[PDB]
Design a protein around this nucleic acid. Structure first.
Length: 71
DNA sequence: CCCTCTGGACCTTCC
DNA sequence: GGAAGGTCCAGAGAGG
């Protein structure tokens, strides 16, 4: 079962969590409040501050298709 | 000694 | 429109 695609937002939240952990390895992390602030941040980002992540998504999009052609 | 699932907010992909 | 299925997850149950 090939993993499902990961949107730019999925990549962004993963990255926000990697970035948050490294500087605060003491991290509580509440499902509801981590989600809210990641998406509150995604709003204040620009079409190309986001680009870094859509690229990661376009890549993982190609990955899915490639694994998909064998399952 | 060492994968899967569940709750749920939020977002994009897909029907 | 809105379901499906991603991201964030600790702890428990299932199994090597």
């Amino acid at each position: 079962k090939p993993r499902g695609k990961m949107s730019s937002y999925a990549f962004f939240v993963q990255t926000c969590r990697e970035e948050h952990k490294k500087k605060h390895p003491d991290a509580s992390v509440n499902f509801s409040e981590f989600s809210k602030k990641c998406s509150e941040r995604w709003k204040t980002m620009s079409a190309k501050e986001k680009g870094k992540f859509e690229d990661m998504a376009k890549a993982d999009k190609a990955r899915y298709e490639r694994e998909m052609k064998t399952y």
